[PDB]
Design a protein around this nucleic acid. Structure first.
Lengths: 141, 151, 129, 262, 149
RNA sequence: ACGGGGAAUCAGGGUUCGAUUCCGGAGAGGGAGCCUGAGAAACGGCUACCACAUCCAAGGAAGGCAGCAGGCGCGCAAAUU
RNA sequence: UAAAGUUGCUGCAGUUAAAAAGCUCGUAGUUGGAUCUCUCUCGGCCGAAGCGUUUACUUUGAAAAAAUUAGAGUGUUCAAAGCAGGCCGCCUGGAUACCGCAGCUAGGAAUAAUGGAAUAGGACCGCGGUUCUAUUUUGUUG
RNA sequence: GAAGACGGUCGAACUUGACUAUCUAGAGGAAGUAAAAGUCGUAACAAGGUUUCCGUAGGUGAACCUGCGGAAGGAUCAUUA
């Protein structure tokens, strides 16, 4: 059992502090390896340059080709795969253009069928993918 | 014993000892008055300080220190320095989240006058805060209370 | 070994009350145990009890009236101020209409209501309801 | 950091000035003077925020440079001059004398006094010392050095000072049964009779003071200022007589006054 | 239970309620003191003295006839041993186990039991040192132990 | 990781944040040394070296926006010369 | 951040879901059975210098920057705000609470620790052996 | 009373020695992980066709086999004077 003594404050606090390191979220948020291995470097978004268009095959139960792009981040030169969300939206992207990329919503985790893809394209050429999708804006010339 | 154990002559600065002598007033020794003061806060001057021969400029009773500020207590744990002893102050620190306490301690290096003979490890000492006496000494032993196990 | 003889006494009372017994034997007895039992009795929770005097430490035969739901000890004896008394009442008592937290204060051993009346904190010994 | 500071933020000013928070970033930094920074009322606060003869600090400067304001009988043109407890502020042009006195809320009230009572003040002696060929000097709470005081006068006593000559007229000893005011702490501004002083050698003495309404409180010895011999003050008191009211009593009094006034 | 064994034995003396000299016992307090003195001179420890006072002289409890315990009686007269009886017996048992272990060096059970006995010896010595029965410099050694026996 | 007052959340207990207008500290590109002065190891003072950089008639001279605006750069990220 | 009693002090789990060290000993650490119900003096219906061994605890008091929070008053046209305002020159506010821990202070004496005669150097009650008496020397040095 | 000089002291100071790291012109070796029920088998799940598993050691294309000791989470809570 646990120690219940008026002078056990140090032991209880030390035990709590050591046992917190066995929590995956606490260890992730307090070690620095996750922060240093995060391609965004702790940011919410990052700008990158599209290196090529790729088609990632959905996981085994489903069957589709998710259109993604290989982008190299300007901040650190790291290469990542960013999903191009909507349909026909890969047509809005051209090679070697600047894209603003956010996370996929699961904090470094793959989302849905797309295996190993944790980023999604938010902007291409300083215009949001949603504005191009609905015809609100057109690609800069 | 012989108080002149240093390369400089040891004396109380207040006392003028080589006043002009008198042959009839000589009785074997020249006689030496003792400078002593009472520190405040109801602390009695030990009989040693009033009737001793030691020279200690950091003694609260015969030296040049003033007792002002905190009056603290502790148990003597080391007596390996010259006129300085290491006492241990023990206490309980309250951790609020656990509503509990932890045993903490810290060691204070305090000046011990030669007027306090028979001070032992485990004795309780009431010390008074003075000006910095050395790098780490800021308290002077004012009173010594024996440990119950002494015999 | 045995520590907190009050804990053992209250555990014996609780286990006997769960079993429906009319009497319980508590040994060893103590001043704290007797004072706690008296505080229990003045509120009508246990009824009369007898102290058997053996010449090392007492025993207590407590008659049990089936009015007791839970008697418990709070170890360690946390020191409780008047401000924290409401939080302790919320934590330990089933309702604000009944149930008593027993504290040892400089005025003696008494329930939390009497502690508020005498305007004193203390150390929490236990509770009963 | 380096050298003295010369500014005072509006929110870092003493709270008894009752300054706003939106009327600028700075508060009038009181000049050096007889009273402490946090226990004084700068002349601009008195002439603008309290008396409302000025709407801006420039108007306070205009008023003061006409030499219309005298503190303790001396004309002061410094609009940030630190005026503190017991100071007499005389305006001969409008013919009114005030004494800087504490209210039971711990704030300098606008207390009007007669021209006859503006001729003197009360000063608590802060120290007495023999110096300069044996002359006894006495220092007061307003830094007034008086030579050759009465040998009976000791520290914590009160002396009546004639403002024209700056010399001691009479004195009240610090003793049980003497009227006094509290000049610091939680009980600031309260007036009562000293009942017991309990000494703490090497520490602060604590003085117990009983109100004229029976209420008793305690302060540190440094916060006591003897006001009168017995229970009669030697100076006029504010609308409240040093009797601090509870919030319930004050609310009841306010409601009754509004009922009986309008 | 036992300090160094898994046993939870309950056997022990059960003292009677009365704290009075029994009716059958005609021995006065001084007579019991003299018998104790003679038994101590014979070289018997307080446990043995109490055993033979109970078993042959009808002295149920010497404390209830004399008002003093046997060890205290011996200390007052001045013929009490230097070190206490239980500590002496523990040291004797440890010496015997060590002497056995020198000629039987493959007895790991003997080594385990010697460790247990020496732990008991150290606990008792620490207690007696806090109570100032033993000098603060007193220590138990693996060489001078047989001298103390 | 400037500290605190404090902020978000919070049944009770707690968890996280506090560069940021108030108080205290530190620094003025990095180090170091000084003059003056009551007060500075001051940088909208000086003297060097280190890095960067301006004008030159090539002999020399002159620098310090983590002040207010405004540029560049950096970036997901922040306004008027 | 809450949800997360999925970091569990309150308040989690550890036969088989993740998990008790192979087994004892052992120092520090943590925890530890019953028991014990206010005195010499001073200005005659007071006042006290205290050492009653202290500590923890609890209660009180003092002291403790505003701003923020809580909160009193006040129709910013309501409100977030602000510290203003109100009446036919006058009247009134600019409250109050909290401010942890450590330090200071005065009560309580349950609980927890500690201590007081045991080897008698033991408590109270009146004197010897080594010395000078803080000027008891007041018509003068003494 | 200026320049200057000796001597001290503080002491910055375009590279070597303890460069802990990272990023890489850089192939190799060993893994892991994800794809694919492609290939060779069938180790385990039924007594899974030699009961399974543990520690240890050796051997093998590979699952694995075997020796010694242990466990039942066994396929026996039982087997008889």
């Amino acid at each position: 059992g646990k120690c219940r003594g008026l002078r056990t404050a140090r032991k209880l606090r030390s035990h709590r502090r050591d046992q917190k390191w066995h929590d995956k979220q606490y260890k992730k948020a307090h070690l620095g390896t996750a922060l240093k291995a995060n391609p965004f470097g702790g940011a919410s978004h990052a700008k990158g340059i599209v290196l090529e268009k790729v088609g990632v095959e959905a996981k085994q139960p489903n069957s589709a080709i998710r259109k993604c792009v290989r982008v190299q981040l300007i901040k650190n030169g790291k290469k990542i795969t960013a999903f191009v969300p909507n349909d026909g939206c890969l047509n809005f992207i051209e090679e070697n253009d600047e894209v603003l990329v956010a996370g996929f919503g699961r904090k470094g985790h793959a989302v849905g069928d797309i295996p190993g893809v944790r980023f999604k394209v938010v902007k291409v050429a300083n215009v949001s993918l949603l504005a191009l999708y609905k015809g609100k804006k057109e690609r800069p010339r | 014993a012989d108080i002149q154990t240093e390369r400089a002559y040891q004396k109380q600065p207040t006392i003028f000892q080589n006043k002009k002598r008198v042959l009839l007033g000589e009785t074997g020794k020249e006689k030496l008055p003792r400078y002593y003061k009472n520190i405040g806060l109801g602390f009695k001057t030990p009989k040693e300080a009033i009737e001793g021969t030691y020279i200690d400029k950091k003694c609260p009773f015969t030296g040049n220190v003033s007792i002002r500020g905190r009056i603290l207590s502790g148990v003597v744990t080391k007596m390996k320095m010259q006129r300085t002893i290491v006492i241990r102050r023990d206490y309980l620190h309250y951790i609020r989240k656990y509503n509990r306490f932890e045993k903490r301690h810290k060691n204070m290096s305090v000046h011990l006058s030669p007027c306090f003979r028979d001070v032992q490890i485990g004795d309780i000492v009431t010390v008074g805060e003075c000006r910095p006496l050395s790098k780490t000494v800021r308290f002077n032993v004012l009173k010594v209370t024996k440990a119950a196990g002494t015999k | 070994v045995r520590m907190n003889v009050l804990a053992d006494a209250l555990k014996s009372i609780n286990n006997a009350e769960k079993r429906g017994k009319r009497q319980v034997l508590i040994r060893p007895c103590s001043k704290v145990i007797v004072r706690f039992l008296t505080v229990m009795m003045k509120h009508g929770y246990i009824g009369e009890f007898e102290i058997i005097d053996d010449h090392r430490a007492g025993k207590i035969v407590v008659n049990l009236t089936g009015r007791l739901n839970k008697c418990g000890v709070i170890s360690p004896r946390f020191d409780v101020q008047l401000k924290d008394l409401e939080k302790w009442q919320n934590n330990l008592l089933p309702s604000r209409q009944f149930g008593f937290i027993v504290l040892t204060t400089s005025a003696g051993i008494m329930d939390h209501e009497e502690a508020r009346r005498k305007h004193t904190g203390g150390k929490i010994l236990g509770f009963f309801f | 950091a380096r050298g003295p500071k010369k500014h005072l933020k509006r929110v870092a000013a003493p709270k008894h000035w009752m300054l706003d928070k939106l009327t600028g970033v700075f508060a009038p930094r009181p000049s050096t003077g007889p009273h402490k920074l946090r226990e004084c009322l700068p002349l601009i606060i008195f002439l603008r925020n309290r008396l409302k003869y000025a709407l801006t600090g420039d108007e306070v400067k205009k008023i003061c440079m006409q030499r219309f304001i005298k503190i303790d009988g001396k004309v002061r043109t410094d609009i940030t001059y630190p005026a503190g407890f017991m100071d007499v502020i005389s305006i001969d042009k409008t013919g009114e004398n005030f004494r800087l006195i504490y209210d039971t809320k711990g704030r300098f009230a606008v207390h009007r006094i007669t021209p006859e009572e503006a001729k003197y003040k009360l000063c608590k002696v802060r120290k007495i010392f023999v110096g300069t060929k044996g002359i006894p000097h006495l220092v007061t709470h307003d830094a007034r050095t008086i030579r050759y005081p009465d040998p009976l006068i000791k520290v914590n006593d009160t002396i009546q000072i004639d403002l024209e000559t700056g010399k001691i007229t009479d004195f009240i000893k610090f003793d049980t049964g003497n009227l006094c005011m509290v000049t610091g702490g939680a009980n600031l501004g309260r007036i009562g009779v000293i009942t017991n002083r309990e000494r703490h050698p090497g520490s602060f003495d604590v003085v117990h003071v009983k109100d004229a309404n029976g209420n008793s409180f305690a302060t540190r010895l440094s916060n006591i200022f003897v006001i009168g011999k017995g229970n009669k003050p030697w100076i006029s008191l504010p609308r409240g007589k040093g009797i601090r009211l509870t919030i319930a009593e004050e609310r009841d009094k306010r409601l009754a006054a509004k009922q009986s006034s309008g | 239970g036992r300090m160094h064994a898994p046993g939870k034995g309950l056997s022990q003396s059960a003292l009677p309620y009365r704290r009075s000299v029994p009716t059958w016992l005609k021995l006065t307090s001084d007579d019991v003191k003299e018998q104790i003195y003679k038994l101590a001179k014979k070289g018997l420890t307080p446990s043995q003295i109490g055993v033979i006072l109970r078993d042959s002289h009808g002295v149920a409890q010497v404390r209830f006839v004399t008002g003093n315990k046997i060890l205290r009686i011996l200390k007052s007269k001045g013929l009490a041993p230097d070190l206490p009886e239980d500590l002496y017996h523990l040291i004797k048992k440890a010496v015997a186990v060590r002497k056995h272990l020198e000629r039987n060096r493959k007895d790991k059970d003997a080594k385990f039991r010697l460790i247990l006995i020496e732990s008991r010896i150290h606990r008792l010595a620490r207690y007696y040192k806090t109570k100032r029965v033993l000098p603060p410099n007193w220590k138990y050694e693996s060489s001078t132990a047989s001298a103390l026996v």
